[PDB]
Design a protein around this ligand. Structure first.
Ligand SMILES: [Ca+2]
Ligand SMILES: [Ca+2]
Lengths: 89, 96, 95
């Protein structure tokens, strides 16, 4: 309903069942939203950082972080994480 | 005015990733600009839509005379200047 | 538990003589060391400890009477005396 435990901007049942971010607020997911380009997100309702990266579930889902981060890291289950490496020539 | 602890490196990547680069190369002078684009995949990207003509008008401060943009007195309309793109932009612009 | 910014201190002993004790410099600091892991991780090569001053601009010297027995069939030993590292906590924001 409106109970929030991990203390982000997403309620418990929304994270448990499914939610999408529109107009900077979290709303329940309806299957008719898919054809507009929206995505279904599920997170952990007892943790503020489901993946463990610096950004919380709300920041990742709403795309409220560094705009250079790839759009496939906006779901809470995928971590924003670089794999920098070095090669010699 | 404080200029210590304010780095451009924090905004270089965030700006290059949501913008298109336009370079106007006049005689004995060069200009480079970044104009914000819009992502049509994301439904929550409310950035205003622009065409290349409006982007060129905004970036370099050109003023229309009879529907054709002039920089100061130099014609910059597509029929009076030479446009050069890379392979990706050429492919993305030939189909549109 | 993991240890961040591992900075061990080691001794080098030839026969009964401690040649030098060197603390890890910025070249030989491991940022991450999870339990059961190793630095460098398995599959990589060992890291070279070949400097003795604070800024890594001075090599480790040995005596002539030490090198003589070093090349005469005697080996050196390494003993770790202490290790200093860090641990992670959450601040007032959530980082
Ligand atoms: Ca929550
Ligand atoms: Ca959560």
């Amino acid at each position: 309903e409106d109970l929030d435990t991990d203390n982000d901007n997403i309620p418990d049942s929304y994270e448990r069942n499914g939610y999408t971010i529109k107009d900077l607020i979290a709303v329940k997911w309806e299957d008719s939203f898919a054809e507009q380009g929206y995505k279904k997100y599920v997170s952990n309702y007892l943790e503020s950082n489901t993946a463990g990266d610096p950004y919380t579930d709300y920041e990742k889902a709403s795309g409220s972080f560094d705009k250079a981060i790839k759009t496939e890291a906006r779901d809470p289950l995928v971590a924003a994480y670089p794999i920098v490496g070095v090669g010699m020539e | 005015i404080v200029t210590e602890g304010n780095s451009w490196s924090d905004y270089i990547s965030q700006i290059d990733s949501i913008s298109a680069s336009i370079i106007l190369d006049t005689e004995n002078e060069s200009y480079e600009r970044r104009v914000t684009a819009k992502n049509l995949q994301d439904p929550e990207d409310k950035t205003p839509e622009l065409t290349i003509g409006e982007a060129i008008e905004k970036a370099f401060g050109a003023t229309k005379k009879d529907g054709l943009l002039y920089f100061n007195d130099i014609p910059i309309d597509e029929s009076c200047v030479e446009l050069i793109f890379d392979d990706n932009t050429a492919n993305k612009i030939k189909d549109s | 538990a993991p240890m961040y910014k591992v900075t061990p201190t080691t001794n080098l002993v030839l026969d009964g003589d401690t040649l030098s004790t060197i603390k890890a410099q910025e070249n030989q600091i491991g940022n991450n060391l999870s339990p059961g892991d190793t630095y460098p991780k398995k599959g990589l090569s060992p890291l070279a400890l070949n400097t003795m001053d604070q800024f890594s601009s001075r090599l480790i010297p040995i005596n002539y009477d030490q090198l003589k027995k070093l090349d005469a069939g005697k080996q050196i030993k390494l003993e770790t005396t202490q290790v200093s590292g860090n641990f992670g906590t959450k601040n007032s924001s959530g980082q």
